Amino acid sequence: EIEEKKAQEESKIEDVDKILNDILSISSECIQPDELRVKLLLKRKLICYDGFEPSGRMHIAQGLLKSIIVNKLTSNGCTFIFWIADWFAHLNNKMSGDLKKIKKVGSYFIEVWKSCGMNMENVQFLWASEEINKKPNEYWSLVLDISRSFNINRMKRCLKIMGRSEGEENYCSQILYPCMQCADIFFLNVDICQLGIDQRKVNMLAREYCDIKKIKKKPVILSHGMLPGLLEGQEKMSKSDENSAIFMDDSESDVNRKIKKAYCPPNVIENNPIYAYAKSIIFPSYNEFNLVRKEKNGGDKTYYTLQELEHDYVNGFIHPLDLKDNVAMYINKLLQPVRDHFQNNIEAKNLLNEIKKYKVTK
Amino acid sequence: AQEESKIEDVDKILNDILSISSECIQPDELRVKLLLKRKLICYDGFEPSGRMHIAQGLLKSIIVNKLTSNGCTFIFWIADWFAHLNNKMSGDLKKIKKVGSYFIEVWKSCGMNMENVQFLWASEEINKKPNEYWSLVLDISRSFNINRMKRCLKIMGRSEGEENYCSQILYPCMQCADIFFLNVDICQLGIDQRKVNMLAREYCDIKKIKKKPVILSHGMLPGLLEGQEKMSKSDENSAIFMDDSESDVNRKIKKAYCPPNVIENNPIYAYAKSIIFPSYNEFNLVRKEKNGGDKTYYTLQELEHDYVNGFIHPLDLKDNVAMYINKLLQPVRDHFQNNIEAKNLLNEIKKYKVTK
Ligand SMILES: Nc1ncnc2c1ncn2[C@@H]1O[C@H](COP(=O)(O)OC(=O)[C@@H](N)Cc2ccc(O)cc2)[C@@H](O)[C@H]1O
Ligand SMILES: Nc1ncnc2c1ncn2[C@@H]1O[C@H](COP(=O)(O)OC(=O)[C@@H](N)Cc2ccc(O)cc2)[C@@H](O)[C@H]1O
Ligand SMILES: [Cl-]
Ligand SMILES: [Mg+2]
Ligand SMILES: [Mg+2]
Ligand SMILES: [Mg+2]
């Protein structure tokens, strides 16, 4: 009974190390893998979350890239919260600060995520407005206590989380908003903040708040990297950077048109967004990269690892046009279930029609 | 023609109010208000951050009773969450609430036990309508930049000099929201609060709200010692407290600043002018014959002439101001000496360390 106990304990540590190692694989940065390892030792599921301003069409980093990450976590003992940050978009002047339009876009985001090929068993969609107003004393008390703990300058270091900067006129809303986002982490009892690296400053503020308050339960920051825009030098795909985005409602022709003229330098993967889509979206989705091409250009070839793919790209074995053509085809295939849903479901088709009539305000 | 009477009345009302007030942001709006066949809503707000000083009881009572007697409601906003946000009473909301309770006991025994006065708790009222309240706070924050809002630091007793926490941006957004949340017609606070009252009127113009609050600011009662332009818990030994005993009052007044011939920033004279003379409609100065003998003052003009000309020595003014303050505090003393439950409450809050 000492050797089966030993074999019971060994098998558990190997499981955790493998669970940790590929939870880390979706990530650009983890603020303490050792703390993540610790948290995966709990019997319970770990609460993870990301949050979204409903501010316009959804681009493929928020749908396609997101679902890969969420699927990895929910198949590894996590629960995942999508926080529909409607009050936040309103505070940040989005959708002309019209909350009815914001909530329409939020419903649209949920329709997208539900047809994204995410396993939904351990996924929840929570609306900021609804949840804050279920427990408004607890929530605003937290907001106020966070505001007392940090000075203004420190909080202005979080402007990037709302797409703002010191350069513009800074409204007091830009102090309230990061206090609220920080409060959300505690309000939602999050174990893992799982947002893009542009949100990291307010996730670090939350850890700092823990030290200030002598809270030992600190959230782990599991940041994912920025999916780049189509054009050279666009580090971040977004509605804000013109011509940078493929959207979740783009048609098969739109995707083909956008990929064709995207930046894809020969022999180079640094700052190459076509390669980035291959590496961050297609390869995790398919677990191989199957490069299809004409016999004239070398026929088809399957890449079973990312190193294989990189090697053949930098040495000119893969021409840019072959890389672009396959990336377009795989993005189109990954968007097929979303397209089907908005063609076959007339309520959802309606809703997409309504939200596309809106004006994208900043 | 009976609106003739209506207009004569209101004009008299307005003249009295402006005299006691230090500044009124638009008499003409206040006149329009006073000519609404409804009850106007007035308010003042207090952080429960320590013992109450005489500006907040004895002086407060004079303007409150003038407004309520004309049909107004006067809300005393017990700003418990604001005190916690402003780091008072060690941020112990339980102590803040006990202080708030003791405030109500003081106010009820110094002239505010009345139908037209409401004692409302900030925490309680915000949590009845939290979506409405916080939506306002957020929309106010969107409307003003950080520099504009830091111009309100004085309303919390803070300055640009010290470390400015984000709580000092949130607090004025919340105090501004209160004005609309409480449907206030007249903000009747000290002049140290005027920056955020002006922000509320600016918010109305930004939002095209035509119902704008009148700001009716009262002047600051000076502290006991030289150059303390404002009595406060903040300056130690600046304050006479509503719970001070007769020996405490006598001790503090004897020690106080009272420059001969000088009325400017002379706190002893300020207490005579702003509290005693309005409360009694006269000032009876008791003195020995060799020092000028007893004299009854029926106007502030004569009191000022006699003081500036050296007819009233500072010791005589002090002895009489102390007598009168003790007289005015007698109903408070009797309440806390007899109402054993108020007695126990005073004994507890006296034991609280005042924090900033
Ligand atoms: N190009 C890209 N590549 C990869 N990830 C991306 C890219 N663009 C955006 N994201 C990620 O999408 C999510 C939404 O983005 P956004 O709506 O801007 O978030 C905000 O405003 C946040 N303050 C919203 C918010 C509010 C409260 C709260 O408690 C949590 C969050 C974030 O995780 C972004 O990092
Ligand atoms: N020496 C003095 N002479 C004459 N009046 C004085 C003197 N000292 C203080 N007051 C006056 O007493 C009252 C309380 O004072 P405080 O508790 O400091 O107020 C604050 O902090 C206010 N932000 C509290 C507040 C919060 C929310 C809101 O919706 C309204 C108000 C104010 O009206 C002061 O002007
Ligand atoms: Cl409400
Ligand atoms: Mg082929
Ligand atoms: Mg009453
Ligand atoms: Mg005599």
mmCIF file of C-alpha atoms in Angstrom, chain A residues 57-58 60 108 230-231 237 243-262 274 277 324 327-329 331-333 335-336 339 343 352 356:
data_model
loop_
_atom_site.group_PDB
_atom_site.id
_atom_site.type_symbol
_atom_site.label_atom_id
_atom_site.label_comp_id
_atom_site.label_asym_id
_atom_site.label_seq_id
_atom_site.Cartn_x
_atom_site.Cartn_y
_atom_site.Cartn_z
ATOM 1 C CA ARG A 57 -18.108 44.253 -34.966
ATOM 2 C CA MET A 58 -16.160 41.380 -33.410
ATOM 3 C CA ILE A 60 -11.219 37.211 -35.122
ATOM 4 C CA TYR A 108 -24.562 39.789 -30.897
ATOM 5 C CA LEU A 230 -3.218 42.629 -41.608
ATOM 6 C CA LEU A 231 -0.873 45.438 -42.593
ATOM 7 C CA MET A 237 -5.716 43.727 -34.768
ATOM 8 C CA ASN A 243 -7.865 48.070 -42.245
ATOM 9 C CA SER A 244 -6.242 45.825 -39.619
ATOM 10 C CA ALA A 245 -9.046 43.350 -38.909
ATOM 11 C CA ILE A 246 -10.825 40.285 -40.210
ATOM 12 C CA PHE A 247 -14.265 40.306 -38.617
ATOM 13 C CA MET A 248 -16.400 37.383 -37.442
ATOM 14 C CA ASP A 249 -18.999 38.393 -40.034
ATOM 15 C CA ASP A 250 -16.593 38.748 -42.973
ATOM 16 C CA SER A 251 -17.609 36.767 -46.014
ATOM 17 C CA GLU A 252 -15.518 34.127 -47.748
ATOM 18 C CA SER A 253 -14.620 36.749 -50.397
ATOM 19 C CA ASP A 254 -13.864 39.384 -47.735
ATOM 20 C CA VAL A 255 -11.422 37.056 -45.991
ATOM 21 C CA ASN A 256 -9.795 36.112 -49.318
ATOM 22 C CA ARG A 257 -9.573 39.786 -50.265
ATOM 23 C CA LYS A 258 -8.097 40.825 -46.900
ATOM 24 C CA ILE A 259 -5.557 37.996 -46.718
ATOM 25 C CA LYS A 260 -4.348 38.467 -50.307
ATOM 26 C CA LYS A 261 -3.159 42.019 -49.636
ATOM 27 C CA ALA A 262 -1.961 41.374 -46.084
ATOM 28 C CA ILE A 274 -0.099 35.810 -41.957
ATOM 29 C CA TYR A 277 -2.525 33.558 -37.849
ATOM 30 C CA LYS A 324 -1.552 33.294 -47.664
ATOM 31 C CA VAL A 327 -4.309 30.779 -44.127
ATOM 32 C CA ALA A 328 -7.326 32.248 -45.973
ATOM 33 C CA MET A 329 -8.836 28.792 -46.466
ATOM 34 C CA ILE A 331 -9.839 31.044 -41.481
ATOM 35 C CA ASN A 332 -12.803 30.571 -43.803
ATOM 36 C CA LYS A 333 -13.351 27.020 -42.554
ATOM 37 C CA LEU A 335 -15.699 30.891 -39.651
ATOM 38 C CA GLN A 336 -18.123 28.445 -41.355
ATOM 39 C CA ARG A 339 -21.698 31.913 -40.980
ATOM 40 C CA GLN A 343 -27.662 32.425 -42.281
ATOM 41 C CA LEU A 352 -26.378 41.161 -37.208
ATOM 42 C CA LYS A 356 -24.143 46.711 -38.672
#
